[PDB]
Design a protein around this ligand. Structure first.
Ligand SMILES: [Cl-]
Ligand code: NA
Length: 129
């Protein structure tokens, strides 16, 4: 599924991401835009052999099992394919684990390089929430 901007903002709010670990909703929408272009089916293979999955491009080296990343962990205890669903529950629950890991949203490279330090509230402006 390719989400609209305000549609994703509302879904992320219903799943409890607004101000989760201190990160306002616009941070999460910004991160999703530049990680996946709001596409739940996005996948990208990395040079180390791992793959990023879903709307927040969660990586198979640490967070999910895809059966082809040897020596990796599965810290969210999910198959990576669950992160491609049109329902974002699995991606949101796993993202909550990641952002609590100590480095906040700096775990997402696109957030650090394209969202951090910008007016992220612009990403939810005009939405009915
Ligand atoms: Cl933080
Ligand atoms: Na894994």
């Amino acid at each position: 599924k390719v989400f609209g901007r305000c549609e994703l903002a509302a879904a992320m709010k219903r799943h409890g991401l607004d101000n989760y670990r201190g990160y306002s909703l616009g941070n999460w929408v910004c991160a999703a835009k530049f990680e996946s272009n709001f596409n739940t089916q996005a996948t990208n293979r990395n040079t180390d052999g791992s793959t990023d999955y879903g709307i927040l491009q969660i990586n198979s080296r640490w967070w999910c099992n895809d059966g082809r990343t040897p020596g990796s962990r599965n810290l969210c205890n999910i198959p990576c394919s669950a992160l491609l669903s049109s329902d974002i529950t699995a991606s949101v629950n796993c993202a909550k684990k990641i952002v609590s890991d100590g480095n906040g949203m700096n775990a997402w490279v696109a957030w650090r390089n394209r969202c951090k330090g910008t007016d992220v509230q612009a990403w939810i402006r005009g939405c009915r929430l």
